[PDB]
Each structure stands twice: as structure tokens, then as C-alpha cells.
Amino acid sequence: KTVVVTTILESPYVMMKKNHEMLEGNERYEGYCVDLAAEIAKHCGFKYKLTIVGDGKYGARDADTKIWNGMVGELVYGKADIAIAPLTITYVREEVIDFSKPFMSLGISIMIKKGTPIESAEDLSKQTEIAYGTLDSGSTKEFFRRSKICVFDKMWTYMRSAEPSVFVRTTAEGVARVRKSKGKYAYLLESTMNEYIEQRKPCDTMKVGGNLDSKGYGIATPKGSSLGNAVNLAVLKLNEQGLLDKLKNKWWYDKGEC
Amino acid sequence: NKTVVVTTILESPYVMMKKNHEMLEGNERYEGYCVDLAAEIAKHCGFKYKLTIVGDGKYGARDADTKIWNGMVGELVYGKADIAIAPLTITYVREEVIDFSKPFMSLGISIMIKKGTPIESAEDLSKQTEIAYGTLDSGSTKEFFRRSKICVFDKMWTYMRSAEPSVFVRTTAEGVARVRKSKGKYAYLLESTMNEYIEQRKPCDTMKVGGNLDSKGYGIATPKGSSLGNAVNLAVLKLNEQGLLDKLKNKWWYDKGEC
Ligand SMILES: O=C1N=c2cc([N+](=O)[O-])c([N+](=O)[O-])cc2=NC1=O
């Protein structure tokens, strides 16, 4: 009766303990989603086993084979019973799996190295000396691409035609690029990550301006799962008890390095 | 007929009476955020609808003694409406009796003060008495402080609960009025979405200070086992990704602002 919980290895959501070599099972892991999982399980009344998604991805659908990868794939194909991770609620994903109500809110934000004369998305669109880009894939990119707003359309026009490329392969790459471009590059990513990195050494970056949109992380379960109901109520219950905020503050600031 | 009966509440700027509403008939009588949203939801879900205002003008609370729901939530659980399109906060007790779509707007408890008031945060209110402060005498707001584990807020609750004269108001407008009349000696805690709306209305003597003390969400509600929920749920998500929700937000909040 053990529930197979799939999740991704992303800080501070899911991380490896300092001594994960001497540990075994769920005790190996720690972090926001790891703590959350314990709560969700306690209120829904079930035993769970935490497993890291094989390909270490969230969930996208190939345009050719139409196959789902990442944690979404593990849910649609019967490899996992529930996904507890920072998985953003989207239209296409909602069509194939069931999402609970958001346990965390977020949106596209701007990351820059401290000292950079940038304060908003508008500031970027008006200049070029300070290059800026996003992940070469994901909701963040397609946001600007399918945006009928001139500010984001102009930013998109720039990003689309730039030399060298302002797009990055991974997030860690984008963050590093900001730290290494000596204040000549700005990275557009999820606010949750932006404000987490801002609290990590060497603490040479900061979040600027407000969010460009509004997304949400949700606990996903296979379409039609009987588990979805209880889990959904658990999230709402945890939120109304300020537990989600407590968990946030904990892994973002209490364990912060600034 | 196959005309979806849409229940909604009369709260600005979500649903408001037009200019010549007396000369108009049907849905064309109303306007606002939720009115525009309803049109889109119906467009993508493909259905004709009729806008109706909830009789008791309430959102949805379960009377503790009669165990009976009121407002829009009640209209659903008792088969009087097919769908509820309004600023209805997604709560636990409600999710237990109705089906909510994914949030179409995020919000949280915020502090409303009269401009000039020497307050910048909730912690400020808790370290003083010079400036009185309160909330609606019912709802998730007053509920947030009573069951709070944060010291400042539990210190605020201790103050509010035992304060004379009472610092609790009966309506939203009543709380806003008290702020505009207390010459900056009264702060009002309410939904941020409403706080940032009043901040855009005459005479523009109020403002929102500090960040939200929590995080809620407005969602479209439908009765359980409704053949409408899933479609409505996908509609909200798509509208958000197309930036339509943000456009509606900016239209009725800032484009028609007065400050
Ligand atoms: O569901 C998703 N959740 C994500 C969460 C994060 N995150 O910041 O937690 C990131 N990211 O780091 O770029 C990308 C994501 N891509 C997704 O498709």
C-alpha cells in the first residue's frame, strides 16, 4: 500500500543530505517538498516512498513522438502514484494529469548581478548593452514568444535575434552566466528560484522588478486518481495553517546565507 | 433551456451596474472583471449564459447552528445556479462542498492605511496602540489571526479581540470609510485585491503598505460532478497563459484608475 512519490532534485525543494551515503530510503533526502510530502502524507493517511524522476525533468511532450517525459511522464504511464515537486500548473499538463490547488505562487522575474542599472523589464527592452535571455525552453520562453504585449514582444524580438545566443541550456547555466558576465547579462526565470539564489553565496545577485506573469506549483496525480481529492484538501488545509509560508521561510531564509 | 445560469456577487470592480442599466436588459446590464471573464469562459467552453446576482448578496458561509450554506456557495449546493463566477476565495470548507477551478487571481491579507499614517508593516501595528486597527467581523481575514502561530499577529489578535470600542466592521465599505474618517488613526486589514483597487479611487487618500500576510486565490466554482467544471478549469488556465487575466486585471484596476 506504499505510495510511490516521484519528485525532482531541485533546491531547496528536494536536496541530498550531507550524509546521504549512510542513509537509506526517504531519510536520504531533505527540503521543502520533502517536508511537504511528510505533511501531505500525514493528513491523507498513507505511507510513501520518495523517488527521483529518472530523466530529472519536470514534464514536456515531444512534438514528434508526442511522448511525455519527466515527472509528468511517470504519472501518465503508471510509473508513479503522485508528484510532489515545483511542477507549474499548465494547460497541456492539466489535460493529461490532475493538479491540486497551488501550494506555492510565482511568476517570471528578472535576475541581475548586484550593481547593474536595471530595475524592470522595460529598462531592459530600451537598452542592449546589458544582454538578457531565458531558458531555451519552458513556459518562461514561450511567454515572450506568444506575448502580444509590445514590451515583451520587443524583448522577444531582441532575444530571438541576438549574437551570441542569450538562451541557456539549463537554469544553473543561466544563473552562472549572470555571475560571470560581470554585470553585462540579465537572466529571466521563475521568481521562486530567483529569490532563493539571492540568498545563497556569494550573494552577488538580486531580484529586480515585479513578476511579469502568474504561475503556480501544484501536486500532480494521474488523471482519475482517487488520491487527488484528499491531497487537494491537504494543500488547502496546510496553507490555511500558514504551513506553506512557514516551509517557504524556512528553506529560503532561515537556512539562508545572507 | 440550455442557458447556463451564472450566479455572481455585486462587488467592484468585478461586477457593477452600467450607466443606463435601467434602459438595458439581461447580461448587458452589468459590467466589470467577472463580467468580462464570464464572456471568455463561455466562449471557450461554448455555451450561452445568463448573469444573476446572488439574492442575499453573500459569498458562501455555512451557518454553524442550521448547517445551511448561504451566498453563492449555497446557490450551487442547492441547485439554483450552474456556475459561480465571482471573487470567491478558495477555502477548505468550500472545496468540501463545491468544485473550484484553478485560481484566476492571487491575493492575500494586506494593510490599508490613510496616506500619511506612520505604518509600514504589520509588525509596526503590533508594537503600538496609538493607531487602532481591525478587520471584517467574519471571514478568512479575522480567521487568519485567531488561529495564527506568528507572534506579531497573535499579538495583534490579542489586541483586536479585547479592544473597546470594537475595531471590527460589518462590511468592506464600512472598514474603508472608518479609515477615511479616523484621520489616520485606524488601519484596516482586508484582501489585497480590494486594497489596491480602493487605492485607485477618489479621493485617493488611502494606500496599501507592506506585503501580504498570507496567500489566497479566487476561483470559479461549480457543483460537484458537474459536466462543466473540467472545461471551465482548462479555460481559466488558457486565459492566464494568453495574458488575458492580467489584461482584465489592468483594465478594471489601473486603466480606469483615478490616481
Ligand atoms: O513544472 C516546471 N517547474 C519548474 C520549476 C523551476 N524552479 O525554479 O523551481 C524551474 N527553474 O528552475 O527554471 C523550471 C521549471 N519548469 C517546469 O516545467
Ligand SMILES: O=C1N=c2cc([N+](=O)[O-])c([N+](=O)[O-])cc2=NC1=O
Ligand atoms: O469568498 C470571499 N471573497 C471575498 C472577496 C473580496 N474582494 O475584495 O473581492 C472581499 N472584500 O472585498 O473584502 C471579501 C471576500 N470574502 C469572501 O468570503
